[PDB]
């Protein structure tokens, strides 16, 4: 065997692999946003922005531009935009979700004018 015990927490995200991530709400609720769902041009829940002033950020596992497939044991690939929202507010202290990434097109040239 390669690994015996593996946890969704304190662990990186593997590409082309549906991995799970567990985040503790601690005190205040999560601080992120989603986009897509049903009646949308994308049948895959995407994270528009992840407010750094939230539990989700307190971890640093979910990065803006990710694609969720399920949450707290609730399929989202079908759930409507709103549905996906409630599914996030209906989660206990330990919020678990399944994220998926791609193993190609590693944008090596991603840098703005960094103006100020």
What does the largest sheet look like? 5 strands, antiparallel
Helix and strand string, N-terminal first?
Answer: EEHEEHE
Shape: globular
Which class best fits the helix and strand makeup? alpha+beta
How many distinct domains?
Answer: 1
Task: Tell me the span between the first and last alpha carbons.
Answer: 52 Å
The beta-strand count equals 5
CATH superfamily: PDZ domain
Radius of gyration: 15 Å
- The amount of beta strand, in percent, is 15-25%
**Name of the level-1 CATH class:** Mainly Beta
Could you name the CATH topology?
Answer: Pdz3 Domain
How many DSSP H or I helices? 2
Q: Determine the fraction of residues in helical runs and give it as a percent range.
A: 10-25%
What is the CATH architecture annotation? Roll
Write a concise synopsis of the structure shown.
The chain has about 120 residues and is an alpha+beta fold. Helix content is about 10%, strand content about 20%.
How would the blueprint of this fold be written?
Elements (H helix, E strand, L loop, with lengths): L18 E6 L20 E2 L8 H5 L7 E5 L2 E2 L5 H9 L4 E7 L16
Antiparallel strand pairs: 1-5, 2-3, 3-4, 3-5
PDB class: protein binding
Keywords: PDZ domain, Pals1-associated tight junction protein, Structural Genomics
Assembly: monomeric
Keyword list:
monomer; 116 residues; alpha+beta; Pdz3 Domain; five-stranded antiparallel β-sheet; 2 helices; 5 strands; globular; InaD-like protein; protein binding; Pals1-associated tight junction protein
């Amino acid at each position: 065997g390669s690994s015996g015990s593996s946890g969704p927490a304190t662990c990186p995200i593997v590409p082309g692999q549906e991995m799970i991530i567990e985040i503790s709400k601690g005190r205040s609720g999560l601080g992120l946003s989603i986009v897509g769902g049903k009646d949308t041009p994308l049948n895959a829940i995407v994270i528009h922005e992840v407010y750094e002033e939230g539990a989700a950020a307190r971890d640093g596992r979910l990065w803006a531009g990710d694609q969720i497939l399920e949450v707290n044991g609730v399929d989202l690939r079908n759930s409507s935009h709103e549905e996906a929202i409630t599914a996030l507010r209906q989660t206990p202290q330990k919020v678990r979700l399944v994220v998926y990434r791609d193993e190609a097109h590693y944008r090596d040239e991603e840098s703005g004018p960094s103006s100020g």
